[PDB]
Design a protein around this ligand. Structure first.
Ligand code: ZN
Ligand code: ZN
Lengths: 277, 277
DNA sequence: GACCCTCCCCTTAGGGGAGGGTC
DNA sequence: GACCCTCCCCTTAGGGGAGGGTC
């Protein structure tokens, strides 16, 4: 009143940094009532401090400074609408985070899964829960043929749904009394899904199915060109000796263990086939 | 396999921009297996594409690239923990937005309130709902004395609670048969609160109370040095003529109408006193 | 003729000083 | 001796070209 505030005074009163005030000046969002033409000092009236309310509040909810310059130009009925938009945007983030929170949980459940596995290289018969997936025909693809680029299209879709990208790669093949690896070929290659949201227009060459819930003869181990086939043989023998009946393809899942370009790569292999009790 | 991918190929396969790939190279987060020493072209193996899974997923949840370089160096048990932290951080934002969504709603209710007021300059008797507030003693402060800087401390606290800053300024004074404005002085000055969260250590000079729910003789109008007092007189006369009994101080609320430094300032004044039916 | 490469400029909202006057 | 001012540099994660070789 009938006197001015120095930038530092305003800074203490409005709890805004002096740097912020200068910036808001330059950007023409909030300029001092008067600026001493000689010393360049900035002077503010007590009556204009009220404009920092709109700025401080809009800044709190994260609106762009360039956006604020528009807000302090609209009427109440328009500001009312402005806030209605913010609520629409908040609900949006709430849905996003709520879903993201769910996905992280699932990713953790499955992560803990392979961390607390009975024993490696040994065949176990456990009761598996369903695992939703997206697969495709593996036309002319086998164990010694696959490439990460083979899951390219599969990953693209998953990414547009789950947001997250798959970390594990899947394949399936007919249960046969194999003799050598060059004797086997993948039927489908797949990648697990984590979201329940409808993926963008999906192409007809992609199939959304699942790995049935049920009893499975499983075996897990760390990948090794040699152990890959020897372990399958081990699985096969287990079914043969117990005279078990297979009621599904052999499912294969390969998960990387570290993602560190410094240490030598190593993958976890998981094979399991569903049986009739 | 036994050949390389050009940056553009990797870009199409992993659905990552060529610009992003070069950047990830420079930043040493994801570098090409081989770079032609003459043409400087970047070449990627199909086996390293798997490192883009961790990057793409971590990028999705917004982790800093410098942070990813650490993530791809930890073990599964550690990555598991990493995600547990993300869930803690997500819950945090969920609480924040959920609360923010609530505050915007209240701000809108009250905003609509003064937009759909019966008539200006006229006294009305309506049933008001409670309005929580934070007030302080207005030692030596009156209508022709107040300054926005007088609410400085009050605003500081509100800001640390509601996050939002108050847009309306309040005051209260004893109901008397006033003759002139220099005859009146404010008892307390206050600012409304919007959050239900415990504000930081509050000083004992701040009082958290409310404007009681009840029947009030109200009057609203656009501020004018002259109309301010004439309208109070109008309120006073209304109580006197109906022989109404006042059971509260006169409450005053001043809200700005536009926050636009281009147009002439204008405020909305709201005065009301509680009566015994 | 597409592909790829290396600069170089630009973007949010100021925080950190440095060098140097001003209340 | 506090206060304030004007540069100037720095920060995230790349997107946009420009000028010019390369598959
Ligand atoms: Zn098929
Ligand atoms: Zn008191």
């Amino acid at each position: 009143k009938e006197s001015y505030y120095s930038i530092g005074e305003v800074s203490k009163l409005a709890n805004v940094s002096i740097k912020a005030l200068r910036y808001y000046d330059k950007i023409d969002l909030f300029k001092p009532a008067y600026v001493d033409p000689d010393t360049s000092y900035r002077y503010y009236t007590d009556s204009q401090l009220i404009h920092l309310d709109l700025i401080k509040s809009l800044k709190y909810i994260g609106t762009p400074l360039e956006e604020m310059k528009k807000a302090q130009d609209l009427e109440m009925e328009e500001l009312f609408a402005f806030y209605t938009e913010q609520e629409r945007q908040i609900r949006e983030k709430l849905d996003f985070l709520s879903a993201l929170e769910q996905t992280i949980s699932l990713v953790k459940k499955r992560m803990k899964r392979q961390m607390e596995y009975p024993a490696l290289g040994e065949v176990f018969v456990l009761d598996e829960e369903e695992i939703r997936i997206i697969q495709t025909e593996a036309e002319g693809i086998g164990p010694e043929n696959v490439l990460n680029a083979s899951y390219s299209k599969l990953k693209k879709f998953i990414e547009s749904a789950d947001g997250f990208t798959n970390n594990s790669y899947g394949a399936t093949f007919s249960f046969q009394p194999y003799t050598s690896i060059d004797e086997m070929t993948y039927r489908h290659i797949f990648t697990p899904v984590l979201t329940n949201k409808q993926i963008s227009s999906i192409t007809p060459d992609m199939e959304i199915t699942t790995i049935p819930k049920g009893r499975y003869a499983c075996i897990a181990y760390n990948f090794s060109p040699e152990h890959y086939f020897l372990n399958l043989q081990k699985l096969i023998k287990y079914i043969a000796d117990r005279q078990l009946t297979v009621v599904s393809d052999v499912y294969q899942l390969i998960i990387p263990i570290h993602y560190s370009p410094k240490k030598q790569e190593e993958y976890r292999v998981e094979m399991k086939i569903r049986i009739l009790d």
